[PDB]
Amino acid sequence: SARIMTFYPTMEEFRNFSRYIAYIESQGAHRAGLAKVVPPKEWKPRASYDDIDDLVIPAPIQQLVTGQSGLFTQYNIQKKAMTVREFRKIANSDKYCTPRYSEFEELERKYWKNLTFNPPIYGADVNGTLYEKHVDEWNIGRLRTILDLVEGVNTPYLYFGMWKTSFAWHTEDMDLYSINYLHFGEPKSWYSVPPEHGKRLERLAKGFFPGSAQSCEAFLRHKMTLISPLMLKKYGIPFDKVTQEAGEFMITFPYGYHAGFNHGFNCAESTNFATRRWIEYGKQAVLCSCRKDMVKISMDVFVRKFQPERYKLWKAGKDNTVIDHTLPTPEAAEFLK
Numbered sequence: 001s002a003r004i005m006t007f008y009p010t011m012e013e014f015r016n017f018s019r020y021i022a023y024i025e026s027q028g029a030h031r032a033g034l035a036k037v038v039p040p041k042e043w044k045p046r047a048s049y050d051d052i053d054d055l056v057i058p059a060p061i062q063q064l065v066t067g068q069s070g071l072f073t074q075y076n077i078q079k080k081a082m083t084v085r086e087f088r089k090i091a092n093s094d095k096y097c098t099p100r101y102s103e104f105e106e107l108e109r110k111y112w113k114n115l116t117f118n119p120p121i122y123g124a125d126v127n128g129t130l131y132e133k134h135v136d137e138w139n140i141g142r143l144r145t146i147l148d149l150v151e152g153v154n155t156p157y158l159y160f161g162m163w164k165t166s167f168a169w170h171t172e173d174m175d176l177y178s179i180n181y182l183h184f185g186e187p188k189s190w191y192s193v194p195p196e197h198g199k200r201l202e203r204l205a206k207g208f209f210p211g212s213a214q215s216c217e218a219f220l221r222h223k224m225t226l227i228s229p230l231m232l233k234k235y236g237i238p239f240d241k242v243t244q245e246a247g248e249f250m251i252t253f254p255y256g257y258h259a260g261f262n263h264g265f266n267c268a269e270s271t272n273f274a275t276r277r278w279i280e281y282g283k284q285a286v287l288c289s290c291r292k293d294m295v296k297i298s299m300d301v302f303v304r305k306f307q308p309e310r311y312k313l314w315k316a317g318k319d320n321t322v323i324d325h326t327l328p329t330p331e332a333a334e335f336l337k
């Protein structure tokens with residue numbers, strides 16, 4: 001019922017990013033916590049990707065995974081800087097390349113069977129964009145949403161993947177939205193838990209990692225926790241799967257938990273953004289308490305501007321607004337009339 005939806009905008013619908021986000025929420029896409037958007041055929045953010053071999057990945061991370069029975073922890077070892085060419089050569093070498101497979105279910109099995117072995121290298125969190133400066137549609141480098149009121153939380157990031165590189169279970173910083181475009185290469189597969197069931201995932205994680213839970217009120221934000229779909233099935237956490245191919249966007253929604261992995265050599269671009277609906281999520285976000293360095297946004301400017309009637313109430317710790325995860329963002333009103 002809160003399944004992942006896929007959308008196919010026309011060029012005319014595609015041009016206005018925020019308006020289209022409001023549209024898909026009016027269709028209920030936010031309930032799954034994750035949605036796919038396939039852009040029009042004619043649209044490309046870049047003419048060619050042949051000129052980026054010399055691009056530098058300053059801090060590649062080797063992903064060491066420890067665990068068993070569908071529960072794992074992922075550790076980052078920073079490696080020496082390398083170029084995209086060097087990273088590609090490693091990614092496609094026999095040691096690291098994608099194994100043979102027919103259906104996705106086979107590759108998924110191989111992933112969950114082999115994720116503690118032969119730890120791969122992920123060129124993640126690279127500042128940059130691969131959009132040509134003139135592309136005005138869904139330009140992840142400059143989406144100009146109300147998040148701009150805040151390198152940063154609204155600046156673009158590149159992810160150079162190879163087979164079996166992973167992203168762990170998490171919501172975004174300050175439970176923001178996120179946008180992910182797969183520029184090229186092999187697919188990226190996603191898992192998602194509906195926001196309305198998010199705390200059931202937290203409760204389970206808390207039960208399996210009580211030490212981590214004791215040391216931090218939001219340890220999932222460390223992005224170290226991997227949990228297999230079989231474990232989610234066993235413990236009755238609802239979830240959905242989707243595979244993202246080259247040329248496709250993924251949107252994650254506030255408090256939408258997601259995780260996944262790359263199929264082989266690929267490149268993705270991502271940033272965070274906001275709608276008016278996010279503001280309440282941002283006020284109520286449970287943040288990492290154990291590291292000084294984590295991302296924290298002052299919500300004052302947002303409450304003053306878009307919730308002036310509640311500002312003094314909120315600042316006195318008495319705003320008891322309860323979030324209804326099923327409600328679309330106010331901007332979606334025009335599609336419901």
Ligand SMILES: CCN(/C=C/N(C)C)C(=O)CNCc1cc(C(=O)O)ccn1
Binds near residue numbers: 124268
């Ligand atoms: C908005 C981009 N961003 C970066 C925040 N800091 C720069 C780390 C993220 O952390 C988004 N969340 C992690 C993530 C990573 C992947 C992935 O590596 O593909 C997919 C989905 N989500």
Ligand SMILES: [Mn+2]
Binds near residue numbers: 170
């Ligand atoms: Mn994410």
Ligand code: NI
Binds near residue numbers: 049050
């Ligand atoms: Ni290339």
Ligand code: NI
Binds near residue numbers: 079080
């Ligand atoms: Ni090294």
Ligand code: NI
Binds near residue numbers: 208209210
């Ligand atoms: Ni523990």
Ligand SMILES: [Zn+2]
Binds near residue numbers: 215218290
């Ligand atoms: Zn923490």
